[PDB]
């Protein structure tokens, strides 16, 4: 499923992401846009053999199990396929654990490179919230 911008904002807000760990709602919508283009079915292989999954491109090296990343951990205790549902609950709960591990949203390289320090409010502008 390809969310719309204001649709994903409201879905993130309902799952308690707005201002989670100090990060306003626009940061998370921006991060989803540049990691997945709002597509819950997005996947991308990394050079090391791991794969990134779902609307927030969560990495199989650390966070989920896909059965083909030798020596990885499964810290969210979840199969990576659960991160590809049209319901974003599993993705949101795993993001809350990632963003609390010490490096904040710098864990998402596109956030650091394309969202950090920008007018992130523009991403929720005009949405009925
Ligand atoms: Br957009
Ligand atoms: Br594995
Ligand atoms: Br394979
Ligand atoms: Br583990
Ligand atoms: Br949802
Ligand atoms: Br932080
Ligand atoms: Br914002
Ligand atoms: Na893993």
UniProtKB/Swiss-Prot annotation:
UniProt GO cellular component terms: cytoplasm; endoplasmic reticulum; extracellular space
Top EC class, one word: hydrolase
EC number: 3.2.1.17
Compartments where located: Secreted
This protein's record includes keyword Disulfide bond: yes
GO biological process: cell wall macromolecule catabolic process; defense response to bacterium; defense response to Gram-negative bacterium; defense response to Gram-positive bacterium; killing of cells of another organism
Catalyzed reactions: Hydrolysis of (1->4)-beta-linkages between N-acetylmuramic acid and N-acetyl-D-glucosamine residues in a peptidoglycan and between N-acetyl-D-glucosamine residues in chitodextrins
PROSITE patterns recorded: GLYCOSYL_HYDROL_F22_1, GLYCOSYL_HYDROL_F22_2
Residue stretches spanning the membrane: none
Active site per the UniProt annotation: 35, 52
InterPro entries: Glyco_hydro_22, Glyco_hydro_22_CS, Glyco_hydro_22_lys, Lysozyme-like_dom_sf
Keywords tagged on the record: Allergen, Antimicrobial, Bacteriolytic enzyme, Disulfide bond, Glycosidase, Hydrolase, Secreted, Signal
Top-level taxon of the source organism: Eukaryota
Disulfide bonds: 6-127, 30-115, 64-80, 76-94
Residue ranges occupied by any C-type lysozyme domain in the UniProt entry: 1-129
GO molecular function terms listed in the Swiss-Prot or TrEMBL record: beta-N-acetylglucosaminidase activity; identical protein binding; lysozyme activity
Family in the record: Belongs to the glycosyl hydrolase 22 family.
Main function: Lysozymes have primarily a bacteriolytic function; those in tissues and body fluids are associated with the monocyte-macrophage system and enhance the activity of immunoagents. Has bacteriolytic activity against M.luteus.
Assembly and interaction partners: Monomer.
Protein name in UniProt: Lysozyme C
Species: Gallus gallus (Chicken)
Gene name of the record: LYZ
